[PDB]
Amino acid sequence: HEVVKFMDVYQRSYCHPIETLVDIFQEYPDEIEYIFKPSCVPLMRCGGCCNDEGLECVPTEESNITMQIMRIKPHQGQHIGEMSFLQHNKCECRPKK
Amino acid sequence: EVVKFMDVYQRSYCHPIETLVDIFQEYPDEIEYIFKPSCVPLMRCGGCCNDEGLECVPTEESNITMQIMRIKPHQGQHIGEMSFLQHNKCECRPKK
Amino acid sequence: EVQLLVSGGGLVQPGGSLRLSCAASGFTFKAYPMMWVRQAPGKGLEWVSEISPSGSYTYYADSVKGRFTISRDNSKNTLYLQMNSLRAEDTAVYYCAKDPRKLDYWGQGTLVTVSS
Amino acid sequence: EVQLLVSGGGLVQPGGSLRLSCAASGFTFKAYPMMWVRQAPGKGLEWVSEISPSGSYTYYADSVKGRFTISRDNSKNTLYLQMNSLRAEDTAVYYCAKDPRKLDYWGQGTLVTVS
């Protein structure tokens, strides 16, 4: 069978932390010289939609995480260094103000 | 506990991942109505490829049905079955 | 900080009546919409009703509509569900929550049974 | 219909030398970057090297760079890894892959041991 139930759709869709693959150029815009491998990374972020027009999915709690990443300077060597990324811990719908 | 380079490269590579998508993205000609929930959980091609010249694209597709509530403002509502497109498999291909 | 405490359940006759009350605190009750859900023994979850933040828009399930009445007192920070003309099918545990994901707070659940 | 087939590994004493050879098929080899990974017994998977599709760019791990040397022949659809001055820490099973998460293919790994 291939039909999802309304309550199961609602629960899974509602504003919550979810695994999201985000590019590094977005998180670190001031790195035009450097190329990063891999370019994207898996982070817990606040995806989903809210009940009402007046509410928006936002992070109540946050936490950082470290990852082993490579940075490549064009024709000037590279280095498997380390980088920290922001990942949202708990999300909740809040007024837009 | 730091994430190790191989586990980054692996888990960040182009593969089907659960992605939440607005219904108004997929059904633009629905100005009159509001759908709840407005977003739905679908498997789509998330991730990034090795090279600049490669793009993560869907190789294999399939449809999935879900119970969605359509609301017509001040004129009631109804739970109905809506189909959606999701990706079963992805792969990096030349950008052309 | 959140708390949702429910009361007013128990046993009842067929074609009877009950009124549930969900005491809210720890968040801006007035800003959010609220909802009731229920779980029958040996079955999954089922959505019953929603009410908008102002209380101007009410929503009901295909089963309960006409019999059930949802309402709220934004000043007293409470959600009400007036259940009427109850049948054998309505026997379930009733949960009140702003977030449909997070359930099972000490207060949320209350067992409603329709007698024979 | 992908097949990554490796050969070259075995046993050699410290300060030795080896040349591994991966033989790819089932896709447009010229358009993809390739890579080498290894797994020591009891240890996790580890990235070793990469090479661009053109073959003009090379990437190496910090634990090996200066010693190993990657290279590819796009006319023959083969990847190479010139491993020199080997140490006990390099003892692992060496896999050639176009894409990680795909270490299932047959003959994809080869055992390299240091005495």
GROMACS .gro file of C-alpha atoms in nm:
model
  424
    1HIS     CA    1   0.000   0.000   0.000
    2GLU     CA    2   0.120   0.352  -0.089
    3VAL     CA    3  -0.095   0.610   0.093
    4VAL     CA    4   0.016   0.825   0.387
    5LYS     CA    5  -0.231   0.907   0.666
    6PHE     CA    6  -0.321   1.268   0.749
    7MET     CA    7  -0.198   1.256   1.111
    8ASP     CA    8   0.131   1.101   0.996
    9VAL     CA    9   0.169   1.375   0.732
   10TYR     CA   10   0.093   1.649   0.987
   11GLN     CA   11   0.344   1.521   1.244
   12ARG     CA   12   0.629   1.473   0.994
   13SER     CA   13   0.564   1.808   0.821
   14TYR     CA   14   0.542   2.024   1.136
   15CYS     CA   15   0.831   2.256   1.227
   16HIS     CA   16   1.118   2.047   1.370
   17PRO     CA   17   1.493   1.978   1.340
   18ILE     CA   18   1.578   1.782   1.023
   19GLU     CA   19   1.896   1.670   0.846
   20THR     CA   20   1.985   1.928   0.578
   21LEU     CA   21   2.275   1.935   0.330
   22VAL     CA   22   2.407   2.293   0.307
   23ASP     CA   23   2.688   2.443   0.096
   24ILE     CA   24   2.991   2.598   0.269
   25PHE     CA   25   2.997   2.913   0.050
   26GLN     CA   26   2.664   3.006   0.214
   27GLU     CA   27   2.792   2.969   0.572
   28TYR     CA   28   3.132   3.125   0.495
   29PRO     CA   29   3.072   3.388   0.221
   30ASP     CA   30   3.411   3.555   0.282
   31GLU     CA   31   3.614   3.267   0.132
   32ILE     CA   32   3.634   3.346  -0.242
   33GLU     CA   33   3.999   3.238  -0.270
   34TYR     CA   34   3.928   2.891  -0.130
   35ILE     CA   35   3.746   2.584  -0.266
   36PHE     CA   36   3.611   2.329  -0.017
   37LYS     CA   37   3.577   1.950  -0.052
   38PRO     CA   38   3.317   1.833   0.008
   39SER     CA   39   3.133   2.156  -0.075
   40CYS     CA   40   2.819   2.063   0.123
   41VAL     CA   41   2.770   1.924   0.476
   42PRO     CA   42   2.489   1.752   0.676
   43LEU     CA   43   2.345   1.972   0.954
   44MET     CA   44   2.037   1.966   1.177
   45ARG     CA   45   1.829   2.269   1.072
   46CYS     CA   46   1.474   2.397   1.119
   47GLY     CA   47   1.272   2.272   0.823
   48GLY     CA   48   0.894   2.242   0.802
   49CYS     CA   49   0.586   2.464   0.804
   50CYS     CA   50   0.362   2.608   1.076
   51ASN     CA   51  -0.011   2.606   1.155
   52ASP     CA   52  -0.099   2.968   1.077
   53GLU     CA   53  -0.008   3.265   0.855
   54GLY     CA   54   0.119   3.451   1.163
   55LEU     CA   55   0.369   3.184   1.273
   56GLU     CA   56   0.715   3.093   1.140
   57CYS     CA   57   0.949   2.799   1.205
   58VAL     CA   58   1.245   2.927   1.410
   59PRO     CA   59   1.521   2.778   1.633
   60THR     CA   60   1.462   2.808   2.010
   61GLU     CA   61   1.785   2.628   2.102
   62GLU     CA   62   2.116   2.595   1.914
   63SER     CA   63   2.448   2.407   1.919
   64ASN     CA   64   2.769   2.397   1.713
   65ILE     CA   65   2.939   2.090   1.564
   66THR     CA   66   3.291   2.024   1.431
   67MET     CA   67   3.369   1.842   1.105
   68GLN     CA   68   3.685   1.732   0.923
   69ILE     CA   69   3.683   1.934   0.600
   70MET     CA   70   3.937   2.009   0.325
   71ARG     CA   71   4.021   2.362   0.209
   72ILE     CA   72   4.184   2.399  -0.133
   73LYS     CA   73   4.381   2.710  -0.232
   74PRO     CA   74   4.397   2.705  -0.617
   75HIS     CA   75   4.746   2.582  -0.718
   76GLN     CA   76   4.888   2.657  -0.368
   77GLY     CA   77   4.835   2.328  -0.182
   78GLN     CA   78   4.538   2.209   0.022
   79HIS     CA   79   4.473   2.095   0.380
   80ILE     CA   80   4.227   1.862   0.555
   81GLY     CA   81   4.159   2.105   0.841
   82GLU     CA   82   3.861   2.147   1.074
   83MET     CA   83   3.552   2.369   1.062
   84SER     CA   84   3.265   2.431   1.303
   85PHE     CA   85   2.906   2.472   1.180
   86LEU     CA   86   2.587   2.595   1.348
   87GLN     CA   87   2.311   2.333   1.378
   88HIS     CA   88   1.971   2.400   1.536
   89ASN     CA   89   1.887   2.183   1.838
   90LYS     CA   90   1.515   2.244   1.896
   91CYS     CA   91   1.269   2.433   1.672
   92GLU     CA   92   0.931   2.590   1.745
   93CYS     CA   93   0.674   2.804   1.562
   94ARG     CA   94   0.676   3.168   1.680
   95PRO     CA   95   0.498   3.498   1.593
   96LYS     CA   96   0.650   3.691   1.300
   97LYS     CA   97   0.630   4.033   1.472
   98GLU     CA   98   3.333   1.383   1.919
   99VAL     CA   99   3.436   1.525   1.579
  100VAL     CA  100   3.288   1.400   1.251
  101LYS     CA  101   3.551   1.214   1.046
  102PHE     CA  102   3.634   1.318   0.687
  103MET     CA  103   3.514   0.996   0.521
  104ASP     CA  104   3.182   1.009   0.710
  105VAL     CA  105   3.142   1.370   0.591
  106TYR     CA  106   3.229   1.290   0.228
  107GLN     CA  107   3.003   0.981   0.234
  108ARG     CA  108   2.697   1.130   0.405
  109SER     CA  109   2.724   1.458   0.208
  110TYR     CA  110   2.737   1.289  -0.135
  111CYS     CA  111   2.441   1.308  -0.378
  112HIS     CA  112   2.169   1.073  -0.248
  113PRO     CA  113   1.790   1.069  -0.189
  114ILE     CA  114   1.713   1.250   0.138
  115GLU     CA  115   1.387   1.343   0.314
  116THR     CA  116   1.299   1.697   0.207
  117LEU     CA  117   1.000   1.912   0.307
  118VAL     CA  118   0.833   2.090   0.014
  119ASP     CA  119   0.548   2.343  -0.005
  120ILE     CA  120   0.233   2.231  -0.189
  121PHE     CA  121   0.219   2.573  -0.360
  122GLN     CA  122   0.560   2.496  -0.514
  123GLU     CA  123   0.418   2.178  -0.671
  124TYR     CA  124   0.063   2.308  -0.734
  125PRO     CA  125   0.091   2.680  -0.826
  126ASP     CA  126  -0.260   2.705  -0.980
  127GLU     CA  127  -0.429   2.679  -0.637
  128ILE     CA  128  -0.460   3.048  -0.541
  129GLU     CA  129  -0.816   3.004  -0.409
  130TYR     CA  130  -0.733   2.742  -0.145
  131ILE     CA  131  -0.511   2.678   0.156
  132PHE     CA  132  -0.362   2.334   0.224
  133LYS     CA  133  -0.277   2.202   0.572
  134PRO     CA  134  -0.010   2.106   0.624
  135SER     CA  135   0.129   2.341   0.356
  136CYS     CA  136   0.453   2.140   0.335
  137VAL     CA  137   0.496   1.762   0.285
  138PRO     CA  138   0.783   1.512   0.342
  139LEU     CA  139   0.923   1.381   0.011
  140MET     CA  140   1.241   1.200  -0.095
  141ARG     CA  141   1.439   1.434  -0.324
  142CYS     CA  142   1.792   1.460  -0.463
  143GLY     CA  143   1.996   1.637  -0.195
  144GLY     CA  144   2.375   1.658  -0.173
  145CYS     CA  145   2.675   1.768  -0.377
  146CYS     CA  146   2.904   1.609  -0.638
  147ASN     CA  147   3.284   1.582  -0.661
  148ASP     CA  148   3.353   1.814  -0.956
  149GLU     CA  149   3.232   2.152  -1.085
  150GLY     CA  150   3.119   1.991  -1.412
  151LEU     CA  151   2.891   1.736  -1.242
  152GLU     CA  152   2.532   1.789  -1.121
  153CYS     CA  153   2.324   1.574  -0.883
  154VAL     CA  154   2.014   1.474  -1.084
  155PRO     CA  155   1.729   1.221  -1.048
  156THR     CA  156   1.779   0.897  -1.241
  157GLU     CA  157   1.465   0.715  -1.121
  158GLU     CA  158   1.129   0.864  -1.014
  159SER     CA  159   0.795   0.754  -0.867
  160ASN     CA  160   0.468   0.897  -0.731
  161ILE     CA  161   0.337   0.896  -0.372
  162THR     CA  162  -0.015   0.970  -0.243
  163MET     CA  163  -0.095   1.150   0.086
  164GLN     CA  164  -0.401   1.266   0.281
  165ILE     CA  165  -0.413   1.647   0.262
  166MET     CA  166  -0.674   1.891   0.396
  167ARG     CA  167  -0.794   2.148   0.142
  168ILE     CA  168  -0.956   2.451   0.307
  169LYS     CA  169  -1.178   2.700   0.126
  170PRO     CA  170  -1.196   3.008   0.356
  171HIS     CA  171  -1.537   3.043   0.530
  172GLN     CA  172  -1.679   2.755   0.319
  173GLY     CA  173  -1.570   2.436   0.500
  174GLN     CA  174  -1.290   2.192   0.414
  175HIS     CA  175  -1.219   1.827   0.326
  176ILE     CA  176  -0.948   1.561   0.368
  177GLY     CA  177  -0.851   1.435   0.020
  178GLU     CA  178  -0.582   1.222  -0.146
  179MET     CA  179  -0.306   1.417  -0.326
  180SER     CA  180  -0.032   1.260  -0.539
  181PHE     CA  181   0.329   1.386  -0.527
  182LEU     CA  182   0.652   1.318  -0.717
  183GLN     CA  183   0.955   1.180  -0.530
  184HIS     CA  184   1.296   1.046  -0.631
  185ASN     CA  185   1.397   0.684  -0.562
  186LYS     CA  186   1.752   0.723  -0.696
  187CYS     CA  187   2.000   1.000  -0.783
  188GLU     CA  188   2.336   1.021  -0.962
  189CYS     CA  189   2.599   1.279  -1.059
  190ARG     CA  190   2.597   1.348  -1.435
  191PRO     CA  191   2.780   1.590  -1.671
  192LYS     CA  192   2.633   1.943  -1.667
  193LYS     CA  193   2.636   1.968  -2.050
  194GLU     CA  194   0.845   2.562   3.070
  195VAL     CA  195   0.537   2.423   2.886
  196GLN     CA  196   0.240   2.252   3.055
  197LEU     CA  197  -0.093   2.123   2.919
  198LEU     CA  198  -0.326   1.974   3.182
  199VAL     CA  199  -0.652   1.802   3.077
  200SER     CA  200  -0.958   1.698   3.279
  201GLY     CA  201  -1.328   1.606   3.256
  202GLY     CA  202  -1.315   1.252   3.115
  203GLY     CA  203  -1.450   0.918   3.239
  204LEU     CA  204  -1.742   0.684   3.167
  205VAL     CA  205  -2.058   0.793   2.981
  206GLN     CA  206  -2.376   0.650   2.822
  207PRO     CA  207  -2.450   0.625   2.447
  208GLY     CA  208  -2.599   0.958   2.336
  209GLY     CA  209  -2.450   1.122   2.647
  210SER     CA  210  -2.231   1.430   2.697
  211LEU     CA  211  -1.885   1.537   2.821
  212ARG     CA  212  -1.680   1.859   2.830
  213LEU     CA  213  -1.299   1.850   2.834
  214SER     CA  214  -1.074   2.132   2.959
  215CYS     CA  215  -0.704   2.176   2.872
  216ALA     CA  216  -0.525   2.409   3.117
  217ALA     CA  217  -0.238   2.583   2.935
  218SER     CA  218   0.076   2.757   3.065
  219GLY     CA  219   0.443   2.823   2.981
  220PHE     CA  220   0.385   2.987   2.641
  221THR     CA  221   0.183   3.254   2.457
  222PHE     CA  222  -0.146   3.058   2.435
  223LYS     CA  223  -0.322   3.344   2.252
  224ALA     CA  224  -0.076   3.345   1.959
  225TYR     CA  225  -0.102   2.974   1.869
  226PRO     CA  226  -0.381   2.761   1.724
  227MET     CA  227  -0.476   2.455   1.931
  228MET     CA  228  -0.603   2.103   1.857
  229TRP     CA  229  -0.747   1.782   1.998
  230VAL     CA  230  -0.641   1.433   1.891
  231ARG     CA  231  -0.735   1.085   2.011
  232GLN     CA  232  -0.608   0.726   2.018
  233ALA     CA  233  -0.843   0.426   2.017
  234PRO     CA  234  -0.717   0.103   2.178
  235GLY     CA  235  -0.533  -0.101   1.912
  236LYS     CA  236  -0.527   0.177   1.651
  237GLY     CA  237  -0.310   0.470   1.540
  238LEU     CA  238  -0.360   0.842   1.600
  239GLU     CA  239  -0.661   1.035   1.470
  240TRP     CA  240  -0.706   1.410   1.429
  241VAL     CA  241  -1.029   1.545   1.582
  242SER     CA  242  -1.039   1.926   1.571
  243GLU     CA  243  -0.851   2.257   1.545
  244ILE     CA  244  -0.925   2.614   1.652
  245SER     CA  245  -0.753   2.932   1.529
  246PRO     CA  246  -0.570   3.171   1.768
  247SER     CA  247  -0.850   3.431   1.778
  248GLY     CA  248  -1.116   3.156   1.779
  249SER     CA  249  -1.276   3.283   1.457
  250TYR     CA  250  -1.208   2.961   1.261
  251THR     CA  251  -1.293   2.612   1.387
  252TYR     CA  252  -1.211   2.285   1.209
  253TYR     CA  253  -1.350   1.934   1.267
  254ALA     CA  254  -1.292   1.580   1.141
  255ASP     CA  255  -1.531   1.406   0.900
  256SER     CA  256  -1.647   1.170   1.177
  257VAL     CA  257  -1.715   1.413   1.464
  258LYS     CA  258  -1.842   1.724   1.278
  259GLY     CA  259  -2.186   1.840   1.395
  260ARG     CA  260  -2.165   1.666   1.732
  261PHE     CA  261  -1.836   1.806   1.864
  262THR     CA  262  -1.768   2.171   1.953
  263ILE     CA  263  -1.422   2.320   2.009
  264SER     CA  264  -1.369   2.652   2.187
  265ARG     CA  265  -1.117   2.857   2.386
  266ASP     CA  266  -1.090   3.127   2.652
  267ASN     CA  267  -0.778   3.329   2.563
  268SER     CA  268  -0.791   3.524   2.891
  269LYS     CA  269  -0.816   3.214   3.113
  270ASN     CA  270  -0.569   3.019   2.892
  271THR     CA  271  -0.784   2.709   2.839
  272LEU     CA  272  -0.901   2.492   2.549
  273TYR     CA  273  -1.244   2.326   2.561
  274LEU     CA  274  -1.395   2.036   2.366
  275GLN     CA  275  -1.770   1.987   2.405
  276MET     CA  276  -1.844   1.626   2.306
  277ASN     CA  277  -2.209   1.534   2.239
  278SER     CA  278  -2.409   1.236   2.109
  279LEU     CA  279  -2.120   0.998   2.179
  280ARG     CA  280  -2.105   0.649   2.023
  281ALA     CA  281  -1.905   0.327   2.065
  282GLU     CA  282  -1.649   0.451   1.809
  283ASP     CA  283  -1.560   0.762   2.015
  284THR     CA  284  -1.392   0.555   2.290
  285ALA     CA  285  -1.030   0.676   2.306
  286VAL     CA  286  -0.767   0.870   2.502
  287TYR     CA  287  -0.791   1.241   2.417
  288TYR     CA  288  -0.479   1.459   2.392
  289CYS     CA  289  -0.456   1.839   2.364
  290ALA     CA  290  -0.144   2.001   2.213
  291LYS     CA  291  -0.019   2.306   2.022
  292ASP     CA  292   0.260   2.100   1.866
  293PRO     CA  293   0.123   1.781   1.703
  294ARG     CA  294   0.464   1.612   1.741
  295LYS     CA  295   0.519   1.645   2.117
  296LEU     CA  296   0.260   1.448   2.316
  297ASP     CA  297   0.240   1.253   2.647
  298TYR     CA  298   0.290   1.541   2.894
  299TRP     CA  299   0.145   1.431   3.230
  300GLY     CA  300  -0.169   1.641   3.181
  301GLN     CA  301  -0.249   1.593   2.810
  302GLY     CA  302  -0.407   1.246   2.821
  303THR     CA  303  -0.754   1.163   2.952
  304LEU     CA  304  -0.940   0.835   2.896
  305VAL     CA  305  -1.296   0.864   2.764
  306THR     CA  306  -1.511   0.548   2.758
  307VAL     CA  307  -1.860   0.497   2.615
  308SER     CA  308  -2.046   0.240   2.827
  309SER     CA  309  -2.275  -0.046   2.720
  310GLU     CA  310   2.651  -0.178  -1.471
  311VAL     CA  311   2.962  -0.046  -1.291
  312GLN     CA  312   3.276  -0.252  -1.233
  313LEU     CA  313   3.583  -0.122  -1.048
  314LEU     CA  314   3.852  -0.393  -1.054
  315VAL     CA  315   4.175  -0.350  -0.855
  316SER     CA  316   4.511  -0.531  -0.862
  317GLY     CA  317   4.870  -0.483  -0.741
  318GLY     CA  318   4.867  -0.532  -0.363
  319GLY     CA  319   5.048  -0.792  -0.153
  320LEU     CA  320   5.339  -0.808   0.093
  321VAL     CA  321   5.652  -0.590   0.102
  322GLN     CA  322   5.903  -0.498   0.374
  323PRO     CA  323   5.935  -0.148   0.531
  324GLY     CA  324   6.075   0.112   0.290
  325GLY     CA  325   5.931  -0.089   0.001
  326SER     CA  326   5.731   0.007  -0.307
  327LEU     CA  327   5.405  -0.090  -0.481
  328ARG     CA  328   5.188   0.016  -0.777
  329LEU     CA  329   4.813  -0.046  -0.758
  330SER     CA  330   4.595  -0.054  -1.071
  331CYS     CA  331   4.217   0.005  -1.084
  332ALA     CA  332   4.034  -0.093  -1.404
  333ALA     CA  333   3.702   0.091  -1.444
  334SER     CA  334   3.404   0.030  -1.674
  335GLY     CA  335   3.028   0.091  -1.705
  336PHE     CA  336   3.034   0.472  -1.723
  337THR     CA  337   3.207   0.771  -1.884
  338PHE     CA  338   3.538   0.743  -1.694
  339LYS     CA  339   3.674   1.064  -1.850
  340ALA     CA  340   3.406   1.289  -1.693
  341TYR     CA  341   3.437   1.167  -1.330
  342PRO     CA  342   3.700   1.224  -1.060
  343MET     CA  343   3.836   0.906  -0.899
  344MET     CA  344   3.970   0.828  -0.551
  345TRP     CA  345   4.149   0.577  -0.329
  346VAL     CA  346   4.035   0.471   0.019
  347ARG     CA  347   4.172   0.217   0.268
  348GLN     CA  348   4.044   0.027   0.572
  349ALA     CA  349   4.282  -0.104   0.838
  350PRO     CA  350   4.166  -0.410   1.037
  351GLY     CA  351   3.975  -0.300   1.349
  352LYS     CA  352   3.994   0.064   1.234
  353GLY     CA  353   3.746   0.276   1.035
  354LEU     CA  354   3.753   0.377   0.668
  355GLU     CA  355   4.010   0.640   0.567
  356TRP     CA  356   4.046   0.869   0.265
  357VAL     CA  357   4.382   0.850   0.084
  358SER     CA  358   4.378   1.037  -0.248
  359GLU     CA  359   4.183   1.191  -0.539
  360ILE     CA  360   4.238   1.297  -0.900
  361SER     CA  361   4.043   1.529  -1.133
  362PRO     CA  362   3.864   1.406  -1.449
  363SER     CA  363   4.114   1.589  -1.672
  364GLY     CA  364   4.404   1.456  -1.463
  365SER     CA  365   4.562   1.800  -1.413
  366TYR     CA  366   4.477   1.815  -1.039
  367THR     CA  367   4.570   1.577  -0.756
  368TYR     CA  368   4.473   1.555  -0.387
  369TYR     CA  369   4.636   1.356  -0.106
  370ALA     CA  370   4.585   1.277   0.263
  371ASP     CA  371   4.815   1.433   0.524
  372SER     CA  372   4.932   1.091   0.648
  373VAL     CA  373   5.066   0.989   0.303
  374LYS     CA  374   5.138   1.295   0.086
  375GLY     CA  375   5.493   1.312  -0.051
  376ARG     CA  376   5.510   0.931  -0.068
  377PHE     CA  377   5.210   0.810  -0.272
  378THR     CA  378   5.139   0.942  -0.623
  379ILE     CA  379   4.803   0.912  -0.802
  380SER     CA  380   4.760   0.907  -1.180
  381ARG     CA  381   4.503   0.812  -1.444
  382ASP     CA  382   4.495   0.713  -1.811
  383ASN     CA  383   4.161   0.820  -1.962
  384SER     CA  384   4.242   0.649  -2.294
  385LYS     CA  385   4.265   0.310  -2.116
  386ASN     CA  386   4.008   0.376  -1.836
  387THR     CA  387   4.250   0.295  -1.553
  388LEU     CA  388   4.349   0.458  -1.224
  389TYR     CA  389   4.693   0.414  -1.064
  390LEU     CA  390   4.850   0.468  -0.721
  391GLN     CA  391   5.230   0.468  -0.695
  392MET     CA  392   5.293   0.380  -0.328
  393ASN     CA  393   5.654   0.433  -0.210
  394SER     CA  394   5.847   0.411   0.119
  395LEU     CA  395   5.580   0.209   0.300
  396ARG     CA  396   5.534   0.195   0.678
  397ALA     CA  397   5.347  -0.036   0.919
  398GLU     CA  398   5.071   0.226   0.962
  399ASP     CA  399   4.983   0.188   0.589
  400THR     CA  400   4.880  -0.178   0.639
  401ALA     CA  401   4.520  -0.191   0.511
  402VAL     CA  402   4.285  -0.308   0.234
  403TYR     CA  403   4.295  -0.054  -0.051
  404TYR     CA  404   3.978   0.025  -0.249
  405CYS     CA  405   3.940   0.227  -0.570
  406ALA     CA  406   3.608   0.412  -0.604
  407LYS     CA  407   3.446   0.676  -0.827
  408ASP     CA  408   3.187   0.746  -0.558
  409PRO     CA  409   3.209   0.670  -0.185
  410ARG     CA  410   2.943   0.452  -0.018
  411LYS     CA  411   3.003   0.198  -0.298
  412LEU     CA  412   3.265  -0.043  -0.164
  413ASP     CA  413   3.044  -0.346  -0.243
  414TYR     CA  414   3.179  -0.412  -0.595
  415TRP     CA  415   3.375  -0.733  -0.655
  416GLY     CA  416   3.756  -0.723  -0.671
  417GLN     CA  417   3.736  -0.356  -0.571
  418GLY     CA  418   3.968  -0.405  -0.272
  419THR     CA  419   4.324  -0.536  -0.248
  420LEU     CA  420   4.529  -0.622   0.062
  421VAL     CA  421   4.855  -0.432   0.116
  422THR     CA  422   5.066  -0.555   0.409
  423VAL     CA  423   5.389  -0.427   0.565
  424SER     CA  424   5.604  -0.676   0.760
   0.00000   0.00000   0.00000
